[PDB]
Amino acid sequence: GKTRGMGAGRKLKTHRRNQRWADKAYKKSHLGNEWKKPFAGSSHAKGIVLEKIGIEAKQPNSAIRKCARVQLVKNGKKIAAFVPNDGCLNFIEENDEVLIAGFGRKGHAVGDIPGVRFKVVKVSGVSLLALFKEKKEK
Amino acid sequence: MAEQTEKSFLKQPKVFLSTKKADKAKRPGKAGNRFWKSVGLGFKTPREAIDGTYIDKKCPFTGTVAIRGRIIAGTCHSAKMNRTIIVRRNYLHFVKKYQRYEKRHSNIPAHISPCFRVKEGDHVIIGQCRPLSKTVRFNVLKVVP
Amino acid sequence: GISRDSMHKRRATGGKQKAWRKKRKYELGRQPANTKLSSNKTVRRVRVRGGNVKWRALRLDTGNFSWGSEAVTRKTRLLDVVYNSSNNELVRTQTLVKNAIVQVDAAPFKQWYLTHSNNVQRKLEKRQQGRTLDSHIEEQFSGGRLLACISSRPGQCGRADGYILEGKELEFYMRKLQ
Amino acid sequence: ARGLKKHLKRLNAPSHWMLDKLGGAFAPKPSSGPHKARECLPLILILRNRLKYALTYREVQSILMQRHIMVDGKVRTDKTYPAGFMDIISIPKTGENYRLLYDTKGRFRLHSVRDEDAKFKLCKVRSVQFGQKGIPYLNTYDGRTIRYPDPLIKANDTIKLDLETNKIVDFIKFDVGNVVMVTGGRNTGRVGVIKNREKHKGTFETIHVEDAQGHQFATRLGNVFTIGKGTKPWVSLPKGKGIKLTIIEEQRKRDAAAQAA
RNA sequence: CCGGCAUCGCGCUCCUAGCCCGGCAUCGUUACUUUGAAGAAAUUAGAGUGCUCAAAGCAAGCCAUCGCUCUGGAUACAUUAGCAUGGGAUAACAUCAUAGGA
RNA sequence: UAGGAUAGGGGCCUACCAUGGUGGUGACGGGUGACGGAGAAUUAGGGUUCGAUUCCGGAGAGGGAGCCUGAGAAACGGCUAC
RNA sequence: GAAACUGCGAAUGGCUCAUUAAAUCAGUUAUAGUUUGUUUGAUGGUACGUGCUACUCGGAUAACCGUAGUAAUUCUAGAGCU
Ligand SMILES: [Mg+2]
Ligand SMILES: [Mg+2]
Ligand SMILES: [Mg+2]
Ligand SMILES: [Mg+2]
Ligand SMILES: [Mg+2]
Ligand SMILES: [Mg+2]
Ligand SMILES: [Mg+2]
Numbered sequence: 001g002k003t004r005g006m007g008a009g010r011k012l013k014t015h016r017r018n019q020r021w022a023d024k025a026y027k028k029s030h031l032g033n034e035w036k037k038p039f040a041g042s043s044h045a046k047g048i049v050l051e052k053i054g055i056e057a058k059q060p061n062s063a064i065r066k067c068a069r070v071q072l073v074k075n076g077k078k079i080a081a082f083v084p085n086d087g088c089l090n091f092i093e094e095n096d097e098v099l100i101a102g103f104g105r106k107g108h109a110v111g112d113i114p115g116v117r118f119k120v121v122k123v124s125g126v127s128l129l130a131l132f133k134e135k136k137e138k
Numbered sequence: 139m140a141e142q143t144e145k146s147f148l149k150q151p152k153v154f155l156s157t158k159k160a161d162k163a164k165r166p167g168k169a170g171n172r173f174w175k176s177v178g179l180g181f182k183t184p185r186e187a188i189d190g191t192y193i194d195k196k197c198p199f200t201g202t203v204a205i206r207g208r209i210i211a212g213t214c215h216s217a218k219m220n221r222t223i224i225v226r227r228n229y230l231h232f233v234k235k236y237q238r239y240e241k242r243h244s245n246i247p248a249h250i251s252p253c254f255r256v257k258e259g260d261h262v263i264i265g266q267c268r269p270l271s272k273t274v275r276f277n278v279l280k281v282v283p
Numbered sequence: 284g285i286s287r288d289s290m291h292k293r294r295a296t297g298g299k300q301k302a303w304r305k306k307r308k309y310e311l312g313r314q315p316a317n318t319k320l321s322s323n324k325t326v327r328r329v330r331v332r333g334g335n336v337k338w339r340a341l342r343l344d345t346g347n348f349s350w351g352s353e354a355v356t357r358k359t360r361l362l363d364v365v366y367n368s369s370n371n372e373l374v375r376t377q378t379l380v381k382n383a384i385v386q387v388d389a390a391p392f393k394q395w396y397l398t399h400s401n402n403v404q405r406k407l408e409k410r411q412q413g414r415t416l417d418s419h420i421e422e423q424f425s426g427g428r429l430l431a432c433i434s435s436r437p438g439q440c441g442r443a444d445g446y447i448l449e450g451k452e453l454e455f456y457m458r459k460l461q
Numbered sequence: 462a463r464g465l466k467k468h469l470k471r472l473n474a475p476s477h478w479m480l481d482k483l484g485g486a487f488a489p490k491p492s493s494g495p496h497k498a499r500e501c502l503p504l505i506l507i508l509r510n511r512l513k514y515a516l517t518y519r520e521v522q523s524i525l526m527q528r529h530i531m532v533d534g535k536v537r538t539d540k541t542y543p544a545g546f547m548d549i550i551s552i553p554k555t556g557e558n559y560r561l562l563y564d565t566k567g568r569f570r571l572h573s574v575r576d577e578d579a580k581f582k583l584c585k586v587r588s589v590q591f592g593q594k595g596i597p598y599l600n601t602y603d604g605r606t607i608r609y610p611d612p613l614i615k616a617n618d619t620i621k622l623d624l625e626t627n628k629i630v631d632f633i634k635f636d637v638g639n640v641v642m643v644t645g646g647r648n649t650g651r652v653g654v655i656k657n658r659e660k661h662k663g664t665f666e667t668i669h670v671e672d673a674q675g676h677q678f679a680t681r682l683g684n685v686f687t688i689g690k691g692t693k694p695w696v697s698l699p700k701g702k703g704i705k706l707t708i709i710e711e712q713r714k715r716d717a718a719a720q721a722a
Numbered sequence: 723c724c725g726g727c728a729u730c731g732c733g734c735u736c737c738u739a740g741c742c743c744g745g746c747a748u749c750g751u752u753a754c755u756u757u758g759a760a761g762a763a764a765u766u767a768g769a770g771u772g773c774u775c776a777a778a779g780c781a782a783g784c785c786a787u788c789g790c791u792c793u794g795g796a797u798a799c800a801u802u803a804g805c806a807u808g809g810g811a812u813a814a815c816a817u818c819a820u821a822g823g824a
Numbered sequence: 825u826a827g828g829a830u831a832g833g834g835g836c837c838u839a840c841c842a843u844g845g846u847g848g849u850g851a852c853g854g855g856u857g858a859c860g861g862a863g864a865a866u867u868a869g870g871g872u873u874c875g876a877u878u879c880c881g882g883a884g885a886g887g888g889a890g891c892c893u894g895a896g897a898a899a900c901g902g903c904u905a906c
Numbered sequence: 907g908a909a910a911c912u913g914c915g916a917a918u919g920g921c922u923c924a925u926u927a928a929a930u931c932a933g934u935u936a937u938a939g940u941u942u943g944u945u946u947g948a949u950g951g952u953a954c955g956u957g958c959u960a961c962u963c964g965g966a967u968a969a970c971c972g973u974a975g976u977a978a979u980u981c982u983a984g985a986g987c988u
């Protein structure tokens with residue numbers, strides 16, 4: 001059972017200190033490996049498109065998910081970013097600047113796309129939203 | 139005498155030993171008499187300091203140091219230095235989240251006048267003075283074995 | 284330069300102490316004066332904090348010395364340094380500091396003690412009732428000099444002042460000079 | 462910092478100046494003088510703020526360069542001069558005289574006095590001791606040093622000082638049974654009568670005081686300033702005769718005064 | 723709710739000391755609790771006030787809205803540590819069998 | 825212990841002497857994408873996280889180091905050297 | 907009155923948060939362990955006369971005027987004044 005002594009404050013406080021490391025969220029935020037990730041603790045990052053690849057969807061689905069492999073400017077890492085909309089892959093060209101964000105779920109893959117946790121949100125300084133909705137052109 | 143054991147003759151400041159017209163009742167430290175003082179704050183000058191032969195510049199009762207500041211009470215923890223002790227203060231620190239306590243301690247160096255005798259683990263009362271060495275800022279005033 | 288801060292020191296635990304600051308001018312020290320005992324007197328002023336002055340004496344020759352039991356203070360010369368309780372090499376270098384032991388010409392004291400018609404003798408006779416002059420001083424006198432201790436800080440006030448040894452102190456330094 | 466500070470930012474100014482927090486970035490920063498600059502009231506506030514004799518910084522300077530304002534008997538042209546407790550501010554051009562006294566809320570007020578009660582002040586002695594050539598002199602708590610005092614005046618007592626002759630004319634012996642006005646802490650402004658003094662060897666002495674309307678309180682020695690001998694005080698009191706009251710008492714005061722209007 | 727006593731209440735010279743009389747100080751310490759002092763402002767809470775409301779701000783309101791009147795610019799919270807005050811249940815630590823007791 | 829130095833206490837530094845001092849009540853070391861505080865966000869209560877930034881305190885002026893002037897600077901909208 | 911000598915100030919303010927984890931810092935102390943231009947109040951004999959009421963007046967520098975150097979700078983030399 002729990003220690004209950006009046007003079008037990010050290011035991012309780014040190015015990016909580018030790019046991020908090022068993023919690024995945026605490027350990028994820030207090031261990032430092034987020035600075036080793038592609039974005040290095042950033043919401044967005046700019047990159048240069050290296051190639052367009054295209055990835056299959058997992059078993060219950062069947063489709064080709066069209067993604068662009070990007071190189072991050074700040075650190076030179078290489079990632080794959082989904083291009084969200086119908087026909088927006090044709091806006092992407094080779095060696096153009098692109099603004100990438102997370103997919104949601106904070107670094108964990110979304111939906112049926114295997115091993116992709118990044119999404120393309122801007123190309124050539126112009127939104128994919130404005131290009132898909134014809135508000136602006138590049 | 140017993141005091142003069144160092145490479146220079148040790149004497150109290152401002153007492154003229156080789157006086158001409160001496161006396162036994164003028165005042166402490168007048169006409170050659172050994173100087174002593176009462177520290178104040180309700181402490182009593184030990185007799186061994188009164189009729190003592192030791193010479194200690196740092197003694198509260200016969201030296202030049204004044205006692206002012208805080209008056210801590212603790213237990214002696216170490217008496218293996220020359221005329222200096224380490225005392226332990228034991229206290230309870232409150233841990234607010236858990237609404238409980240824990241035992242903490244602090245080691246305070248304090249100068250011990252030769253007029254006292256301390257074993258290990260005697261109750262000591264120390265009073266604050268000016269820095270006497272790198273770590274010492276307190277002086278022993280009472281020792282209860 | 285030379286500094287008086289605690290930063291370079293190790294903690295009482297023995298742990299090393301990181302530098303969180305540069306050296307401040309209110310923390311300075313200077314190099315010592317090691318006042319030599321020589322004829323060509325030189326005392327050189329120092330501008331110190333508050334706009335004030337200290338007198339660094341580089342070389343002194345004369346001094347002011349008090350003879351306590353006789354209650355007289357006279358200017359005299361310093362002949363040598365014979366014992367220093369801190370470092371002997373100070374003695375070998377004839378360096379004046381506080382609490383050094385020096386020999387003193389003692390003639391101005393002798394001529395004061397030569398003193399002490401009708402009304403003059405009715406006062407010499409008033410004195411000599413309490414003449415003691417313990418033999419230890421008398422022997423030194425016949426030698427010509429007195430052993431004396433410096434009671435001032437030559438590198439601080441630019442002076443060499445002191446007293447002649449008497450009683451317990453005199454005999455202690457005598458047995459140490461043996 | 463590598464030296465003395467010369468600006469006082471407005472949020473750091475004393476709270477009893479009642480300076481508004483958006484009225485600029487700086488506050489007057491009282492110059493050195495006979496009061497401790499945290500318990501003073503500079504001339505800029507006396508003229509511009511309270512008396513509304515001037516509307517701006519420079520108007521106060523235009524007033525002072527003309528030698529109108531007189532502080533304790535001399536003309537002080539310094540603009541941040543630290544006037545303090547029990548000083549007299551006099552404008553002969555308007556023939557008007559003020560004694561600086563506290564109100565119960567702990568803020569300085571200019572209490573108008575007559576010309577008779579403006580040639581004198583009271584001053585509490587910091588200490589008495591000897592000086593060069595054995596001459597005794599006493600220290601006040603506002604800088605004044607007087608030589609050859611009455612050999613009875615001891616520390617913490619009060620003295621009456623005529624501004625004309627600049628010497629003592631009377632004194633009050635600090636002791637139990639005298640009226641005192643508190644000059645520090647939360648009780649500043651409250652007058653009372655010394656009922657008890659308890660010594661503590663090595664710490665501050667504490668005083669226990671009882672108001673004329675019965676309310677009992679306490680302070681420490683340094684914050685007590687005797688006014689008069691016996692229950693009668695020697696100087697005038699402000700709008701409230703130094704009597705603190707609860708918030709409910711003044712709520713009653715406002716609503717009761719709201720029926721006659 | 724509490725003061726002031728009395729039962730089978732270890733004392734006082736010295737401070738306070740009623741008209742022989744309460745309510746005196748050192749010859750075990752703490753934690754705990756009560757009250758007080760001293761605690762920067764800004765922020766927070768909160769009293770007052772019709773910036774036209776509000777977020778605000780520290781103002782303003784009356785005069786015959788005529789040679790000026792009344793003014794305000796409160797109050798509170800502030801864990802731990804340090805200072806002082808009463809309590810002595812609860813719990814620590816020290817300790818009357820060598821009577822070296824009063 | 826005695827000195828020297830300092831505006832002054834002090835191993836601050838020198839000479840001599842003793843063998844100490846801190847540590848599971850966490851010393852010493854390491855990380856900090858760490859200036860501290862007043863404070864901020866969310867708050868049933870208890871809490872969790874944040875505090876580069878206008879107020880207070882500290883520190884620095886490319887990196888170290890040394891200085892003059894002066895009451896006050898180890899100053900950088902001063903100097904000297906690397 | 908410009909210029910110039912003299913004096914004063916430029917050590918405050920402003921910016922930033924790199925270094926720094928009993929350090930800074932906060933509440934709380936201490937200086938009987940010190941410095942403090944300035945403000946404010948008080949205060950001040952003898953300098954030589956063998957203490958017998960005071961005992962004599964300097965040169966030299968800017969602004970100016972004028973001869974230059976150097977590619978150059980609130981870089982700089984020499985001469986005439988006061
Ligand atoms: Mg989880
Ligand atoms: Mg600054
Ligand atoms: Mg000012
Ligand atoms: Mg020393
Ligand atoms: Mg950092
Ligand atoms: Mg940063
Ligand atoms: Mg700042």
Ligand SMILES: [Mg+2]
Pocket residue numbers: none
């Ligand atoms: Mg700096």
Ligand SMILES: [Mg+2]
Pocket residue numbers: 886
């Ligand atoms: Mg830069």
Ligand SMILES: [Mg+2]
Pocket residue numbers: 900
């Ligand atoms: Mg520098």
